[PDB]
Ligand binder design. Structure first.
Ligand SMILES: Nc1ncnc2c1ncn2[C@@H]1O[C@H](COP(=O)(O)OP(=O)(O)O)[C@@H](O)[C@H]1O
Ligand SMILES: Nc1ncnc2c1ncn2[C@@H]1O[C@H](COP(=O)(O)OP(=O)(O)O)[C@@H](O)[C@H]1O
Ligand SMILES: Nc1ncnc2c1ncn2[C@@H]1O[C@H](COP(=O)(O)OP(=O)(O)O)[C@@H](O)[C@H]1O
Ligand SMILES: [Mg+2]
Ligand SMILES: [Mg+2]
Lengths: 363, 7, 414, 167, 300, 372, 187, 7
């Protein structure tokens, strides 16, 4: 548990490697900065500069150690670590607007890039030509694709959009993997199929996430509502309308409990009751911290008496934009990392958070 | 005042 | 009936006031304002709030230089108004004290340099339309009116509507090629090096060498030295040598009066006789950003205009403004331009193969009887015609569209 | 003040229900990043324009979006002198619209002033302090205009005394 | 400048220049200068029939008919002597200076030539001053059309002189500020122990304007001065005439300076609001020290 | 933002730095040395004027001259030398690119600041300057907008009372009595013991003795009777040539002159009574706020136990219900400079410069309009 | 004057030099008939400077100061005093009285005291009062040729009166009623 | 100084 502010400008997106010893962040510009954990302090080890616009999606494949970065220059790059430097391989996305998000597949054989061209790009490799190619899922989509998360069976793909709908497409690529096994979502799974499409018509969808077992899909809306669709119950939707500001990211720490965050800057916890089909506000995870005041010197007193004649009680001073699971997977998580629009990186802990608050029960 | 006394 | 339109040419070092229809400006005052300034602390927008009626305790023009207890401020720098409070007060005394015009019965014709930012025009429109409530305004470029001031001194039958106007005032020097009466705006050149830079250079020269000049007059002297003993040299190092070997003839004496004890001081005017004007043909002497002589700038101006209007433009280069009243200025300008043009023509002939010898381009620099106020008289022409009242921005146009009515001028497209 | 307290509380609560802005690149043009409420290019990134009014002629129109918020204020103007002073004051506010980073050089038609807070203003500057600035403007503008009116009255009296003294 | 002045600067400048050129012995040059003044007055200094030795200064006024009445030229004649000649075609009054018969002390005739409009006005106005001095009640009362939509109703009685300005401004902003500048005009009599009785009215015209053609309406304001025999005696009537003459122009002038006054307070309050906004910009942790120009410091 | 040089340059020691720091970058005694013997060893390099620390180190063969005396510049050539050494040798910065915030004591002749402006604009060509009053900067450094600053430099002492920012210019009390007079008095009284320092090179030794050993006695007569009845106050100082001297009674007799100038043959009141008079000249409604905000500064108020003496002396002159606080921070010597860096780093201060252009058109008479 | 002389560079601090400064004030100072105009004149010429010789041979020259010292009498704001000038003081003292007598006082203003021996103080006082008082009334400043001893002359005339011998405080009266008798015997 | 004191 700690908080580290890498910079004062927002962090667009971050990604960790397998052993959670290095982090790749976006300093709110074209570069990708790879920092390494050295004892208790962070030290920048790599700078990846190939993009023309600011990066909007980074993802780090654990087993193969390949980074994928998509930015607003309509391009994607796959960085591989040659000796001591990261060399990029360009992927031809064939989109005509800025990309928005990128996600490796669980088996690291393909990756999905959601863009603002109203398409999803499933990119894979062609070792016959050393050619990173891509196919397009573009039928029921009518706006930007904001968030992606893959099913544990390497085929299905949850996608939230600015068209108010959360969908579950089938990203089956019949040239890199075998025909998948039937899931409670459907038995017919050709590429580009539509397995599920939410009924919401209000608020954009900032974040979607599959369960640890791939039987539940949860998402957050700008409508302040957090929803969860269960597949073992005829794809039934359980919604919870919050009374705070909207959420931007979420994750599955267990098969029953979610950890969301957003424009409130503090993580909240929700729970799912399968015996009733309804979400419950588990409550705020962070304990409101008391920020110490400092006495003013004479140089600073006059400097802010001439020029201008903390308010927030959490670690982050701006909205939280991305939540990842550090260690423990999604079946039983113990650490989750949050990055927001204040350049900070909060490594949380589930055990310490459950210890600090005894009114907090994780289903 | 105006005439007589001040005010 | 109609009353004559007011013409107010506001320049950096001098403002010319008059009523359109006359032959010369009714007033030529310095563009300065004397206001009461004391030792205060705080911003400039905060110490300018005067209680009561104390914001009308100011003077302008000749009456603002005499006042020894007031602080004299110059609102216009490089032709661009940097202070709008002082400019509004200056305008209100220009209208209500000197011109004695009721600003609701007279169309106004103000002036501007080429590169005046559009926000300056919008502020001028806001001032003249909402504060003074003029029925119509017209902000014409300064040098384009200076062309129609050379017709009073040239023989009949050779008063052309095509020429390159060179206006060198107190704060800015701009070159405007007019052809057949249409301002070729995309070729206008604009250099912020002008008379006042010469006056700063001359005072810095005098202060490094001479002794006995009272500090409070160190500028007032460098103007009397510049506008009296200054000429143009055909060569610089040769002139330095001519001053070094025969100083007894080329070095003059200037005798001024210290206006506190009325004693007389005497200084020696030496190199600053020819180094002053030389910042026209060597602008790096005063501003290290520019490095291009004025002959080369004029040649670029004329060589960018359409082809079949290049030969008449070379024939009617009209000087204007005070800073061009230096002895043999036009002569050196024409000499350099003739050199450039003849060299280019010989190169074109050589490249052609040597079969035709084209007509040598006639280059002429026109000094006339009206240079010191050549702009204003031009305005006094334009603001005396009927068609003038068809190109002004009527009060209705402002009341409808707003100050953005005055946002366009012939230097930029769309 | 204390007569604008519920009106200002409602305006402030509606301001921090919007101003939850996010970065967003355009959809109708290749690589531009423009405020989506100013261009009105996509109708899916535009929230409902909500009006909060204290009476018929004092109101705030809030137009939200995914990376921008446009807050137009129609101020109280009781008589013609207050109208003239409010016009001139809003104009002198627009003149410096790069020192006010959240200001707009021209008000929305029908409204007296307009602020345009994009997402960069909420990433690089404090959000709650922007809300506080808007609410403080709405609190103090009436008072400042009334003091302008009193200044005009004092100027008129001084001018009258300066004339009638010479007789 | 608080109080407007009565002497025109262009006339004085031009005539002084001509008289300096003539007194030094230089040959006279041509002159043709046309200009204007307040209240729609039009001046023209020229030469009669290209005669470069004579300078004729003509003036066209708005009280055209009131000056042609019998006895309205006593002051003009008295002050201008032989300089007063027949009006130039299209103008109303005309002086004629011969550059070869100029008397000594050329400052006095130029000081009296710059006040041509003031003298034309005071000539048509001292009629009632005399009608009151001579102890006659019910003397002639008239309406001087000193402008084109505004009037000045003058009346002379046994013991007073009543002057009623019927005034109206052209612009809407000027009208709105003029309502205030005229409402607050009775608060001036607290600045002096001797000031003429001033009455303001815009609900209804006074009872003096019910037999006469002075401009009336629902957009016009009426300002009544009651000049008593301590403001119209033979020693303090010059100042009274100057003030009654330049009153409307002075009010217009100060209405138009009120805006340039208010602009400073508005700039101050704009800066005060910018200082409240500044609380939103997060203070930097380290700034790079620059130079007066703005370039890098180039040193520690 | 712009970097503006802050050059205190009071009498005694010149302290120059950049605006925005917490301590002056270069502090050196404002002296100018001149060789007073023939040069015989040619080829080693020689100079005809040493400035600052170099003149101090070589003081054995120089005639140290102070260009400033009692807060007034008396030799402008040496002042220009000092400024040149400050600009091009200590700070090593081009002066024609940075504004300059100089300081001047109150109630000095106007010709002083006039010639200062003329020198700074016509010799070094600074683009802008500003001449501030020392005590106002001292109050800036203390981080408060109300109080009476009591600045006792090396050549001049002065008090300035300020309330809510509105300084009262009719109660500013100046007193030409400071470290140099005390140094001369110590030179005088050191003879009675048996030591004679008479040359301007040994005045530096006497100044070091003063600022290392001298201190202020809380009760003068008690301390006199004590040090005159027992050898428990004597201290020994080693001259730069091995000799050791022992001073007893003199230790507190040197600074005591500050509290009763009758020792120096002067008529003016002590510094405590001067401060009390300055306070009493202000209106009755602010005195209580001044008593609790007395501020000391200058290197002459660095004597051990002077805050307690000033408190004990003012408390005897003020009503028994007023609380007397002597706010003496341990960084008092640099306070006048520290307030300067605070001032020149403000945003609105850019509107208070004297721009080179404004001077080029108005001569030196502009400082009286732009700077109070 | 001791304070403003430091502007020129002259420092008089001890009580012995206060007498020199007082001799300068009572030999060179004069009341200006128009303060702003005299200030503008003394700032654009050298015809207002006068040289005084200290009693050691040193010669000083004072210019603008000559009339800035007595001007404090008409503008105490220079001394940081809130009170009004002596002209407004006299006018207010007159206006405190009944109406019918305000005329006579206007024509019988009698200066007195040494401080009113400044050249040009009568004219300045007259101008100020006639600018304050109504225009009909007449203002006459009775500044006698001598007014340094006028109080003493009046005291002599009073003591030499024959009707005054019944108003002395007699020794027996003091021995009977103590000092406080001075509050009832004397007005 | 010029008069009084040295400086
Ligand atoms: N005869 C002259 N010779 C040289 N310089 C002159 C002459 N007359 C004026 N100047 C310079 O030109 C400037 C004034 O000319 P002007 O055309 O009025 O400029 P502006 O119109 O911009 O004020 C001043 O800087 C003055 O020194
Ligand atoms: N810490 C100290 N203790 C005692 N005396 C000191 C101390 N510091 C400085 N002084 C003496 O005070 C005198 C004047 O102080 P100084 O700071 O030099 O004035 P200024 O600030 O004008 O340069 C110096 O000569 C020095 O000897
Ligand atoms: N001619 C003068 N000019 C200026 N000041 C004077 C003049 N004569 C006297 N004074 C000053 O006025 C003060 C009063 O003078 P005086 O008539 O002696 O009354 P008092 O006896 O109360 O002092 C004196 O202190 C003196 O300094
Ligand atoms: Mg010009
Ligand atoms: Mg000091």
């Amino acid at each position: 548990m700690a908080y580290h502010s890498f910079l004062v400008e927002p962090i667009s997106c971050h990604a960790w490697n397998k052993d959670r010893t290095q982090i790749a962040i976006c300093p709110n510009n074209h570069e990708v900065h790879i920092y390494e954990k050295s004892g208790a302090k962070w030290t920048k080890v790599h700078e990846l500069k190939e993009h023309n616009g600011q990066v909007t999606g980074i993802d780090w494949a654990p087993e193969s150690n390949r980074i994928v970065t998509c930015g607003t220059d309509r391009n994607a790059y796959v960085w591989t670590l040659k000796g001591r430097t990261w060399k990029p391989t360009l992927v031809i996305l064939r989109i005509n607007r800025a990309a928005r998000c990128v996600r490796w597949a669980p088996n690291e054989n393909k990756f999905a890039v959601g863009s603002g061209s109203r398409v999803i790009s499933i990119c894979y490799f062609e070792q016959e030509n050393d050619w990173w190619v891509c196919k397009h899922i573009k039928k029921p989509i009518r706006s930007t694709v904001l968030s992606l998360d893959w099913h544990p069976n390497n085929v299905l793909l949850a996608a939230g959009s600015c068209d108010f709908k959360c969908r579950i497409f089938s990203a089956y690529i019949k040239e890199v993997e075998e025909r998948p096994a039937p899931t409670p979502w459907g038995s017919k799974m050709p590429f580009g199929e539509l397995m599920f499409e939410s009924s919401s018509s209000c608020g954009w969808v900032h974040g979607v996430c599959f369960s640890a077992s791939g039987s539940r899909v949860a998402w957050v809306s700008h409508d302040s509502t957090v929803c969860l669709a269960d597949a073992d119950k005829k794809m039934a939707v359980a919604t919870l309308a919050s009374e705070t500001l909207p959420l931007l990211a979420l994750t599955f720490i267990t098969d029953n409990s979610l950890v969301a965050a957003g424009h409130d800057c503090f993580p909240v916890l929700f729970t799912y009751d399968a015996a009733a089909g309804m979400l419950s506000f588990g409550g705020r995870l962070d304990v409101p911290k008391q920020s110490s005041q400092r006495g003013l010197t004479a140089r600073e007193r006059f400097q802010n008496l001439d020029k201008k004649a903390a308010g927030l009680d959490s670690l982050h001073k701006n909205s939280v934009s991305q939540i990842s699971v550090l260690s423990g997977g999604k079946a039983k998580c113990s650490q989750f990392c949050t990055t927001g629009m204040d350049g900070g990186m909060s490594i949380w802990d589930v055990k310490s958070l459950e210890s600090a608050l005894k009114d907090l029960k994780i289903k | 005042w105006x005439a007589x006394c001040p005010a | 009936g109609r009353l004559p339109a007011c013409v107010v040419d506001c320049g950096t070092g001098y403002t010319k006031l008059g009523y359109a229809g006359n032959t010369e400006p009714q007033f030529i005052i310095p563009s300065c304002i004397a206001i009461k300034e004391s030792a205060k602390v705080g911003d400039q927008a905060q110490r300018r709030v005067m209680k009561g009626v104390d914001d009308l305790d100011f003077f302008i023009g000749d009456e603002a230089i005499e006042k020894p207890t007031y602080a004299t401020k110059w609102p216009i720098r490089h032709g661009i108004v940097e202070d709008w409070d002082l400019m509004e007060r200056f305008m209100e005394q220009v209208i209500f004290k000197y011109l004695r015009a009721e600003p609701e019965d007279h169309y106004f014709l103000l002036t501007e340099p080429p590169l005046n930012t559009p926000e300056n025009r919008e502020y001028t429109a806001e001032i003249m339309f909402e504060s003074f409530n003029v029925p119509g305004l017209y902000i014409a470029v300064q040098a384009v009116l200076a062309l129609a001031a050379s017709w009073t001194s040239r023989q009949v039958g050779e008063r052309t509507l095509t020429g390159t106007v060179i206006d060198s005032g107190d704060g800015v020097t701009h070159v405007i090629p007019v052809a057949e009466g249409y301002v070729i705006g995309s070729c206008i050149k604009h250099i912020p090096i002008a008379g006042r830079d010469i006056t700063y250079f001359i005072q810095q020269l005098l202060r490094d060498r001479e002794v006995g000049i009272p500090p409070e007059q160190s500028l007032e002297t460098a103007k009397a030295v510049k506008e009296r003993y200054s000429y143009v040299c055909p060569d610089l190092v040769k002139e330095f040598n001519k001053y070094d070997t025969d100083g007894s003839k080329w070095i003059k004496q200037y005798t001024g009066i210290n206006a506190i004890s009325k004693k007389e001081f005497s200084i020696d005017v030496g190199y600053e006789r020819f180094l002053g004007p030389e910042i026209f043909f060597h602008p790096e002497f005063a501003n290290p950003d520019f490095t291009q002589p004025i002959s080369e700038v004029v040649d670029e101006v004329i060589q960018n205009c359409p082809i079949d209007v290049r030969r008449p433009l070379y024939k009617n280069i009209v000087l204007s403004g005070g800073s061009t009243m230096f002895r043999d200025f036009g002569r050196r300008l024409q000499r350099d331009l003739k050199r450039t043009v003849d060299a280019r023509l010989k190169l074109s002939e050589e490249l052609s193969g040597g079969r035709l010898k084209p007509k040598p381009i006639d280059v002429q620099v026109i000094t006339h009887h009206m240079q010191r106020y050549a702009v204003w008289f031009g305005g006094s022409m334009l603001a005396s015609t009927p068609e003038f009242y068809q190109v002004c921005h009527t009060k209705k146009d402002y009341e409808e569209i707003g100050p953005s009515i005055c946002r366009h001028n012939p230097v930029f497209g769309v | 003040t204390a007569t604008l307290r519920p009106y200002l509380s409602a305006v402030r609560a509606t301001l921090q229900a919007a101003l939850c802005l996010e970065n967003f690149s355009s959809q109708v043009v290749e690589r531009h990043n423009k405020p989506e409420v100013e261009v009105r290019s996509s109708k899916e990134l535009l929230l409902q324009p909500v009006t909060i009014s204290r009476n018929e002629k004092e109101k705030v129109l809030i137009e939200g979006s995914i990376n921008s918020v446009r807050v137009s204020i129609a101020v109280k103007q009781a008589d013609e002198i207050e109208k003239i002073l409010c016009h001139k004051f809003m104009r002198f506010m627009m003149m410096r619209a790069e020192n006010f980073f959240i200001l707009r050089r021209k008000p929305v038609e029908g409204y007296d002033i307009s602020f345009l807070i994009t997402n960069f203003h909420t990433e690089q500057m404090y959000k709650h302090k922007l809300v506080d600035f808007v609410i403080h403007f709405m609190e103090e503008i009436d008072k400042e205009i009334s003091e302008m009116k009193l200044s005009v009255n004092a100027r008129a009296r001084i001018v009258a005394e300066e004339f009638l003294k010479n007789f | 400048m608080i109080l407007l002045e009565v002497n025109n600067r262009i006339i004085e400048e031009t005539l002084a220049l001509k008289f300096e050129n003539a007194a030094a012995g230089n040959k006279p040059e041509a002159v043709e200068v046309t200009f204007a003044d307040f209240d729609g007055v039009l001046y023209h200094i020229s030469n009669p029939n290209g005669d470069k030795t004579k300078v004729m200064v003509s003036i066209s006024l708005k009280f055209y008919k009131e000056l042609q009445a019998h006895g309205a030229d006593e002051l003009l004649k008295r002050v201008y002597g032989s300089f007063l000649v027949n009006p130039e075609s299209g103008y109303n009054v005309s002086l004629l200076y011969d550059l070869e018969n100029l008397p000594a002390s050329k400052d006095s005739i130029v000081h009296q030539a710059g006040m041509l409009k003031r003298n034309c006005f005071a000539s048509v106005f001292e009629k009632y001053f005399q009608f009151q001095e001579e102890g006659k009640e019910g003397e002639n009362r008239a309406v001087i059309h000193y402008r084109d939509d505004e009037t000045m109703y003058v009346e002379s009685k046994k013991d007073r002189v009543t002057v009623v300005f019927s005034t109206v401004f052209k612009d809407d902003d000027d009208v709105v500020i003029g309502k205030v500048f005229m409402q607050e005009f009775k608060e001036g009599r607290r600045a002096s122990h001797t000031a003429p009785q001033v009455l303001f009215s815009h609900r209804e015209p006074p009872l003096e304007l019910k037999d006469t053609d002075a401009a009336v309406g629902d957009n016009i304001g009426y300002i009544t001065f009651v000049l008593f025999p301590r403001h119209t005696n033979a020693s303090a009537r010059d100042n009274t005439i100057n003030l009654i003459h330049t009153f409307r122009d002075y009010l217009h002038y100060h209405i138009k300076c009120s805006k340039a006054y208010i602009h400073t307070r508005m700039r101050a309050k704009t800066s005060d609001f910018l200082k409240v906004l500044n609380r939103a910009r997060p203070d930097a942790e380290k700034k790079e020290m620059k130079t007066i120009t703005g370039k890098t410091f180039s040193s520690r | 933002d712009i970097a503006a040089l802050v050059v205190d340059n009071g009498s005694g020691m010149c302290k120059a730095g950049f605006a925005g720091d917490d301590a002056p970058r270069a502090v050196f005694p404002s002296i100018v040395g001149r060789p007073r013997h023939q040069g015989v060893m040619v080829g080693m390099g020689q100079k005809d004027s040493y400035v600052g620390d170099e003149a101090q180190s070589k003081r054995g063969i120089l005639t140290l001259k102070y260009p400033i005396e009692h807060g007034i510049v008396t030799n402008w050539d040496d002042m220009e030398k000092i400024w040149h050494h400050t600009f091009y040798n200590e700070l090593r910065v081009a002066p024609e690119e940075h504004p300059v915030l100089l300081t001047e004591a109150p109630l000095n002749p106007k010709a002083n600041r006039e010639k200062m402006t003329q020198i700074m604009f016509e010799t070094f060509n600074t683009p802008a300057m500003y001449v501030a009053i020392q005590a106002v900067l001292s109050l800036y450094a203390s981080g408060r907008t109300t109080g009476i600053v009591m600045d006792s430099g090396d050549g001049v002492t002065h008090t300035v009372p300020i309330y809510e920012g509105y300084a009262l210019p009719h109660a500013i009390l100046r007193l030409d009595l400071a470290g140099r007079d005390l140094t001369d008095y110590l030179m005088k009284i050191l003879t009675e013991r048996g030591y004679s320092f008479t040359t301007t090179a040994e005045r530096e030794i006497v100044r070091d003795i003063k600022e290392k050993l001298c201190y202020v006695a809380l009760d003068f007569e008690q301390e006199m009777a004590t040090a005159a009845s027992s050898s428990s106050l004597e201290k020994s100082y080693e001259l730069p040539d091995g000799q050791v001297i022992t001073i007893g009674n003199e230790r507190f007799r040197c600074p005591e002159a500050l509290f009763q100038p009758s020792f120096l043959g002067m008529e003016s009141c002590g510094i405590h009574e001067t401060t009390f008079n300055s306070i009493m000249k202000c209106d009755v409604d602010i005195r209580k706020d001044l008593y609790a905000n007395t501020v000391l500064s200058g290197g002459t108020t660095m004597y051990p136990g002077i805050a307690d003496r000033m408190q004990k002396e003012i408390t005897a002159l003020a009503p028994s219900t007023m609380k007397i606080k002597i706010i003496a921070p341990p960084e008092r010597k640099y306070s006048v400079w520290i307030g300067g860096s605070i001032l020149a780093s403000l945003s609105t201060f850019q509107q208070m410069w004297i721009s080179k252009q404004e001077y080029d058109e108005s001569g030196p008479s502009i400082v009286h309009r732009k700077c109070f």
